[PDB]
Design a protein around this ligand. Structure first.
Ligand SMILES: Cc1cc2nc3c(=O)[nH]c(=O)nc-3n(C[C@H](O)[C@H](O)[C@H](O)COP(=O)(O)O)c2cc1C
Ligand SMILES: Cc1cc2nc3c(=O)[nH]c(=O)nc-3n(C[C@H](O)[C@H](O)[C@H](O)COP(=O)(O)O)c2cc1C
Lengths: 175, 176
C-alpha cells in the first residue's frame, strides 16, 4: 500500500528510541528511513546514509556470528535481537543491542525490515532495566505501525523485555 | 485544559496491553472514569461496577499507610509516583501492585485527571525486574500518545521509568 508507509514515517519522527527502516525488495537492503534519535546516536545525517546498508556502522569484520543470524532472520522474515560492535561517524566504538522486526509484505517475504538500536553502557545502574524498558517501548511502537495485533502485546512486550535483559546479562558476562 | 485528547485517551485505553485507569481530579472523591480490560481482568471486576468509585476499593484499609501518604502527596502536587500496594481482587485474593501514577491535563499543580497503570508482581516466571521495566517502557510510549509527554521528554521519562520500576521490584524482593 502507501497509506501505511506514511503512518510509519510518522511513528519514526516522534519516537523516543532509535528506529531504522530498510527496503527488502532491493538487494543492497538500503535504509529508506532513519529517525532523529538514530542519527543523533550515530552522528550521521539523513542524507549521507539514506540509500545504503547499515553495515556502515561496522568496521572490518567483528561480528561474524551476529551477522550470520541477521542474514538468516532477514531471509526468513523473523524477529531477531542481537548485540553488535558499532562505530559512530567519529569512529568511537559502542555496543548496539539490535532489535529486528519484519514490516509489511507476506510473513516470509516482508516489504521492509525495522531495526531499533539500544546503546549499552549509557544507563544509571541497571542495563537489564534500560534494555527491557527499550524493548517495552519498542513493542508499543511496533503495535502502532500495525505489525503486531492489538491482542498479542501484553506477552510480546514481556517476551521482548525478557529477551533484551537475557541478552544484556550475556553481554556483561563476557569478562 | 482542552479536548480531542479525550477521544484518544479512550483509543489508547481500549487497545493497550497494560492495565490503565483514569481518575477525575476535579472531584475530591476522585472517581474512576476509565478502566480498561487489562485492569478489569486483573482485579476481577466488570467496568460498570467500578466507574464512579475511588480506587482505594482495591485495599483492605490500614495497610499501605506509607504508600498512601506518598500517593496523596503525588495527587496534591500534580506529579508522578511509583509505589507498591497490597491490593485484593473482587474475590478477596491478595496480590502486590506496582502502581504508576501520572498527571494529565490541567495546570502544573492542578491536573484534570490522573492516569494509573497497574503492574501485578510475582506473575512473571522469569525476571520480575525486566517484566516491570518492560511495562514502564511500554507505558511511557502509551503516555506519549495521550499528549502528556512527547518528543525529547518521551525518551528520558521512559528510561527514568524503566529504572524506577526495577528499583521498586528490587526493594519489593528485599523485604521478603
Ligand atoms: C532494519 C535493519 C537495521 C539494521 N541496523 C543495524 C545496525 O544498527 N548496526 C549494524 O551493525 N547492523 C545493522 N543492520 C545489519 C546490516 O544491514 C546487515 O544486513 C548485517 O550486517 C548482515 O549483513 P552482511 O551481509 O553485511 O553480513 C541492520 C539491518 C536491518 C535490516
Ligand atoms: C489514577 C489512579 C489510580 C489508582 N489506582 C490504585 C490502585 O490500583 N490500587 C490502589 O490501592 N490505589 C489506587 N489509587 C489510589 C487510591 O485512589 C487512593 O488515592 C489511595 O488509597 C491513597 O489515598 P487515601 O489514603 O485517601 O486512601 C489510584 C489513584 C489514582 C488517582
Amino acid at each position: 500500500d502507501q497509506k501505511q508507509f506514511e503512518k510509519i514515517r510518522a511513528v519514526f519522527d516522534r519516537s523516543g528510541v532509535a528506529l531504522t527502516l530498510v527496503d527488502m525488495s532491493l538487494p543492497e537492503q538500503p535504509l529508506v528511513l532513519a529517525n532523529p534519535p538514530f542519527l543523533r546516536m550515530t552522528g550521521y545525517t539523513e542524507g549521507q546514509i539514506l540509500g545504503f546498508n547499515c553495515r556502515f556502522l561496522q568496521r572490518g569484520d567483528e561480528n561474524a556470528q551476529a551477522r550470520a543470524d541477521i542474514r538468516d532472520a532477514l531471509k526468513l522474515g523473523r524477529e531477531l535481537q542481537v548485540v553488535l560492535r558499532n562505530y559512530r561517524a567519529n569512529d568511537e566504538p559502542f555496543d548496539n543491542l539490535l532489535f529486528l522486526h519484519p514490516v509489511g509484505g507476506r510473513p516470509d517475504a516482508p516489504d521492509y525490515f525495522l531495526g531499533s538500536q539500544f546503546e549499552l553502557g549509557r544507563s544509571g545502574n541497571s542495563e537489564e532495566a534500560a534494555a527491557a524498558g527499550h524493548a517495552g517501548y519498542l513493542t508499543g511502537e511496533l503495535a502502532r505501525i500495525g505489525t503486531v495485533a492489538a491482542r498479542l502485546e501484553m506477552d510480546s512486550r514481556r517476551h521482548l523485555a525478557q529477551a533484551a535483559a537475557a541478552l544484556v546479562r550475556a553481554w556483561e558476562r563476557r569478562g
